[PDB]
Amino acid sequence: TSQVRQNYHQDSEAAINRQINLDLYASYVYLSMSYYFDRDDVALKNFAKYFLHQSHEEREHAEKLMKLQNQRGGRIFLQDIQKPDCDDWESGLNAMECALHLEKNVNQSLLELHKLATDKNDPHLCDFIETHYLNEQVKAIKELGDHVTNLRKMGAPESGLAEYLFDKHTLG
Amino acid sequence: TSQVRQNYHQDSEAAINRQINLDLYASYVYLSMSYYFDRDDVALKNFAKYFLHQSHEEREHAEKLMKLQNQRGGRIFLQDIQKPDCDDWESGLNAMECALHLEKNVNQSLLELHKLATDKNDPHLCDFIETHYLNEQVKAIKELGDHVTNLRKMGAPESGLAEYLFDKHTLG
Amino acid sequence: TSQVRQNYHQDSEAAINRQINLDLYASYVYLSMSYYFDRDDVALKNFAKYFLHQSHEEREHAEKLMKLQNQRGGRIFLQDIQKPDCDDWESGLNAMECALHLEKNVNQSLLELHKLATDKNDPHLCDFIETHYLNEQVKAIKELGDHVTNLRKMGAPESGLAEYLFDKHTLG
Amino acid sequence: TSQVRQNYHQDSEAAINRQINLDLYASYVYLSMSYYFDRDDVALKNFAKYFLHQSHEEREHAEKLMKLQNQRGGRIFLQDIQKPDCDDWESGLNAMECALHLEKNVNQSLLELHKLATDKNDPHLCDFIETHYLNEQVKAIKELGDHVTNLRKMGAPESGLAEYLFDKHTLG
Amino acid sequence: TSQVRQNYHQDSEAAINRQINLDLYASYVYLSMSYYFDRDDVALKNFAKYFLHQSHEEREHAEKLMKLQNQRGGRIFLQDIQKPDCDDWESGLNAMECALHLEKNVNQSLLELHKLATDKNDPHLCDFIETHYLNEQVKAIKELGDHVTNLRKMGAPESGLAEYLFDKHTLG
Amino acid sequence: TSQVRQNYHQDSEAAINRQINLDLYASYVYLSMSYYFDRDDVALKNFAKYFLHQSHEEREHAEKLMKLQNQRGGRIFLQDIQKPDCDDWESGLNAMECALHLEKNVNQSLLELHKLATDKNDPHLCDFIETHYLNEQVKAIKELGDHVTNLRKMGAPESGLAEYLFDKHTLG
Ligand SMILES: [Zn+2]
Ligand SMILES: [Zn+2]
Ligand SMILES: [Zn+2]
Ligand SMILES: [Zn+2]
Ligand SMILES: [Zn+2]
Ligand SMILES: [Zn+2]
Ligand SMILES: [Zn+2]
Ligand SMILES: [Zn+2]
Ligand SMILES: [Zn+2]
Ligand SMILES: [Zn+2]
Ligand SMILES: [Zn+2]
Ligand SMILES: [Zn+2]
Ligand SMILES: [Zn+2]
Ligand SMILES: [Zn+2]
Ligand SMILES: [Zn+2]
Ligand SMILES: [Zn+2]
Ligand SMILES: [Zn+2]
Ligand SMILES: [Zn+2]
Ligand SMILES: [Zn+2]
Ligand SMILES: [Zn+2]
Ligand SMILES: [Zn+2]
Ligand SMILES: [Zn+2]
Ligand SMILES: [Zn+2]
Ligand SMILES: [Zn+2]
Ligand SMILES: [Zn+2]
Ligand SMILES: [Zn+2]
Ligand SMILES: [Zn+2]
Ligand SMILES: [Zn+2]
Ligand SMILES: [Zn+2]
Ligand SMILES: [Zn+2]
Ligand SMILES: [Zn+2]
Ligand SMILES: [Zn+2]
Ligand SMILES: [Zn+2]
Ligand SMILES: [Zn+2]
Ligand SMILES: [Zn+2]
Ligand SMILES: [Zn+2]
Ligand SMILES: [Zn+2]
Ligand SMILES: [Zn+2]
Ligand SMILES: [Zn+2]
Ligand SMILES: [Zn+2]
Ligand SMILES: [Zn+2]
Ligand SMILES: [Zn+2]
Ligand SMILES: [Zn+2]
Ligand SMILES: [Zn+2]
Ligand SMILES: [Zn+2]
Is there a cis peptide before residue F84, judged by omega within 30 degrees of 0? Predict the structure, then answer.
């Protein structure tokens, strides 16, 4: 037992390790999406930049969880980072829809982690998740929904003109 | 076949995808090492910072290869990022020795990629590897060897004083 | 034989003179394209500016080869600069497609020059072509492919609206 | 007929296309002269710089004529740019004498173009040639004559010392 | 075997030690030339400054090779630096001709080193020689040829006036 | 006899040539020491920097003697620069001890040169040696003795920790 450990349940420690993996996975999904938009036969540079930014942000989410694990005297155990479900992301709209789905899955995991913190009476962990994770998820989900709505209303994915103009006027 | 593709062999394309995975793997190894040094029972903050910096650099190596793949009209295929061989890295000296081994393995992969480029008469690929990868590897290997030598000569790993002072006076 | 000449094969000297002509030819193609877009019945000012910039760049490519010829003690022999294959370039998309074809032809010539340098064991010439020419070609081909893809996806050449908006939002 | 065309005779349009070619030709002559002075066995760097400057200026003359053609609703038709009459320009004095001859030939062409403009009662074209071309020619011819006179009086071409000192003290 | 050594042939290591000596030798030749021009009975201060600058540059060439040897895990073995072939360099022209000969000999050694790197499939060494040495040699040879040509054309070595004026107007 | 020569004995001239060689030799010894500390299996970067600085300084000592020779109308005669007695310098302490020995040998040579100047009633030479050489030697010897004392008292050469800490805290 770490000299620093206090009020930190083994189940919470294990859940934090699962969430570290999930955020690394999310970073990898967005990395794949980014470079899909960098292909010469897709060529939407601002979709590419947008998803690369999200990829680096997810990696920061994972590092802050790793820091948390050590702060509480837990021990980090890393697992393989699974490759994303898709190699080809089809369209800007489809990538946005996939990102929305991903963020809702990450949110569900964080809400389950918060419930575990509650159940184990770990207010420091509750506060950590609330302060640093839950509103980030709500903001991300709202932003992605807004993007999906605009792309659909503009006529994507069939209108390549729509995705081109959204790339310039929203993601620019 | 991509409209941009020219003088780019399928074997080279496949090798670039393997190297993307290897550099992501290297980023993950260094991430794990970094947070080992952040543990309360290790507590070498400059070893932690040094390995986090290397982790972010390896991720940049991988992104530049992804950019290359698309520049040449190849198609990126991502694979799982395997977890590192160790969860516990033992000591600053041991982590440095492991990093040296890793960088020599990465170098061997890059040298094999260069040989493939030569064999397929792909001077653009040869130049890319020479310019952006081979001297970075030689510099990294030299730096890690220098670190290993100093730590050994100072009395690491047995002298916790040695690793403490190296953390301050070399990695600070 | 020039007092400076060393390890410079007569075939390499002749190939450099052919490449000087090819780069001057490329400058002329882009000059013609530029002023096509300046016509009152075409009137795409940013396509015009884009191709004029490429024209001046090709002229710089040719001058640097002329400098190289003299650096190595070869003798420059100029040939006529042939007029481009087209007087009327049809559309922004068609001009981009023509430019892509041209750059791939220039690239093929440079790759053949590099192979000659290899065959004659002229590492200075190999380095000159790799450093100053081959990645410029790869970047140019990628950029033109990206432009072609966007114009096609926006609905060019039939949509004059597409070419108008690309002129403003990409080439502006 | 272009929507912009007004008072622009077909003969004037054809003459402007001939003059575009002549100015491109002049740019090529000066490019060849420039790099002759860059040879290791000639090695007069300021003669080289002087003629490269004139080469770029002639290209600007040609571009302004191309702009004029489109302004008036004429259609640009490019022709091959013939290689210069000489590969070896002999001496600084000889190159200057050749340049003087060239500029007087260009001037004769411009004076014939002005006469055509007069004959077709095209005052806009008359003004264009007078304002942008005729005094440039008179200044260029005077400058080249001055250079020829100095080089002759200093003892060129036989005195390599003369050409060396003129390169430093006049063209520097 | 050094912990850093990888893909570094013993023949390459030995060749790098020979080249270190050759560059030190070149530094010594130029040091001797410099102070010849500082003699009261020669008294060409800018020839003296020019050759002292080249002497210090050759020493930097040698130090960068020493750095390379250690980077690759080779071991530096120094040899005597032989005195130059001449004590008296005769004239500015003769010194320039001697320097041209020296630089072509150094170039031949570097080209042989590059060929060895190729033969031993050492792309890092190939890149090192190409990037840091081969174009420096081509530039140096071209500059010295240009100087020789000017001095000859001005009437050196018989014209002390020529060497005086070149010292002021070229080397100043 | 040089037009400038006055009160300058042939023996003094010969002694100045011997001292030029000795200072070049000293520059070479320190160059060798510097790069020994740059080896991956030694890796003391501040010892390396310290000895490289001394190497460049000795070269300046030699150049100032060459200037002196010409100032007085003597003639410089260069000799081979002998390779140092050691390839491997063993330790920081051993290198410092070797440097101390070298500087005392250089000092003995300078004191003998001063005695010769006295014997030949050459006060300009006496002043040159006193002003520019003798106190530099006394300062260098004192500094090296101080370094030797500290390294010995810290426990070098057996304590690699000692040499590491001296590298940081004294030579940093
Ligand atoms: Zn963000
Ligand atoms: Zn996240
Ligand atoms: Zn980070
Ligand atoms: Zn898997
Ligand atoms: Zn997220
Ligand atoms: Zn709470
Ligand atoms: Zn709560
Ligand atoms: Zn709160
Ligand atoms: Zn770094
Ligand atoms: Zn890497
Ligand atoms: Zn990045
Ligand atoms: Zn696994
Ligand atoms: Zn690495
Ligand atoms: Zn290559
Ligand atoms: Zn190669
Ligand atoms: Zn450009
Ligand atoms: Zn080009
Ligand atoms: Zn130019
Ligand atoms: Zn033709
Ligand atoms: Zn091009
Ligand atoms: Zn090469
Ligand atoms: Zn090559
Ligand atoms: Zn290169
Ligand atoms: Zn001008
Ligand atoms: Zn003109
Ligand atoms: Zn222009
Ligand atoms: Zn012709
Ligand atoms: Zn003109
Ligand atoms: Zn008028
Ligand atoms: Zn008129
Ligand atoms: Zn220089
Ligand atoms: Zn050199
Ligand atoms: Zn140096
Ligand atoms: Zn000898
Ligand atoms: Zn050199
Ligand atoms: Zn190579
Ligand atoms: Zn090579
Ligand atoms: Zn000093
Ligand atoms: Zn000294
Ligand atoms: Zn100096
Ligand atoms: Zn010897
Ligand atoms: Zn000394
Ligand atoms: Zn005295
Ligand atoms: Zn005295
Ligand atoms: Zn300290």
Answer: no
Residue B114 Cα to ligand 36 midpoint, Å, equals 8
Per the CB < 8 A criterion, the answer to whether B100 and B93 are in contact is no
CB C122 within 8 A of CB C9: yes
φ/ψ of D120, rounded to 5, equals -95, 10
How does DSSP classify residue A130? I
Do F91 and F42 meet the contact criterion of CB atoms below 8 Å apart?
Answer: no
**H-run or E-run covering D34:** helix D10-37
CB under 8 Å to B139, separation ≥6 — which residues?
A: E71
**CB A3: neighbour CB atoms within 10 A?**
8
Residues D50, D167 contacting (CB under 8 angstroms): no
Q: Which residues in chain C are closer than 8 Å to B2, comparing Cβ atoms? A: 145
For this entry, resolution in Å reads: 1.5
Instruction: Tell me the CA–centroid distance for residue F78 and ligand 43, in Å.
Output: 27
Distance CA C144, CA B76 (A): 20
Which residue, among A37, A161, A163, A171, would best test binding to C if mutated, counting the most C CBs under 10 Å from its CB?
A: A161
- Rg (alpha carbons) of chain C, rounded to whole number: 18
DSSP character string of E20-79: HHHHHHHHHHHHHHHHHHTSTTT--HHHHHHHHHHHHHHHHHHHHHHHHHHHHT------
> For residues D102 and D82, what is the distance between their CA atoms, to the nearest angstrom?
14
Amino acid at C11: D
Partner residue opposite E6 with nearest CB, options B126, B141, B148: B141
Count of positions (residues) in chain D: 172
Please give the Cα distance from E29 to E52 (Å, whole number): 10
What is the count of residue pairs from A and C with beta carbons less than 8 Å apart? 34
CA distances from D160 to E86, E96, E129, E142 (A): 29, 18, 38, 19
Structure tokens that stand for A52 in this block: 């690369």
3-state secondary structure (DSSP) of residue B84: coil
Token couple for F83: 């390779």
* Nearest CB neighbour to F81, from listed E4, E52, E81: E81
Q: What is the dihedral of CA E160, E163, E169, F2, to 10 degrees?
A: -80
Of the candidates D94, D91, D107, D95, the residue with the CA atom closest to the CA atom of residue D30: D95
> Which method was used?
X-ray
E81: three-class secondary structure by DSSP: strand
Reported as type and span, the H/E element at residue C92 is: helix C92-119
| Cα B72 from Cα C141, distance rounded (Å) | 9
* Ligand closest to the CA atom of residue E129: 37
* CA dist., res. F131 & res. F126, Å (int): 8
**How many beta carbons lie within 10 A of that of residue F121, not counting itself?**
10
Considering only the beta carbons, identify the residue of B31, B35, B70 that sits closest to A38: B70
Residue F87 sits at φ, ψ, to 5 deg, of: -100, -35
With an 8 Å Cβ cutoff, the interface of chain A facing chain C consists of 40-43, 45, 160-161, 163-165, 168
Which candidate in F5, F33, F38, F88 is best for mutational testing of the E interface (most E CBs within 10 A)? Answer: F38
Residue E119's Cβ-side half-sphere holds a number of Cα atoms within 13 Å equal to 11
C-alpha E3: how far from chain center: 33
Query: Which one-letter amino acid corresponds to residue C62?
Result: A
Q: How far is the CA of B73 from the centre of ligand 27 (A)?
A: 39
Q: Cβ separation of E111 and C3 shorter than 8 Å?
A: no
Question: What's the CA-to-centroid distance between B103 and ligand 27, angstroms?
Answer: 58
Closest ligand (CA of B61): 10
Consecutive H or E run containing C100: helix C92-119
Domains and their CATH numbers in chain F: 1-172 (1.20.1260.10)
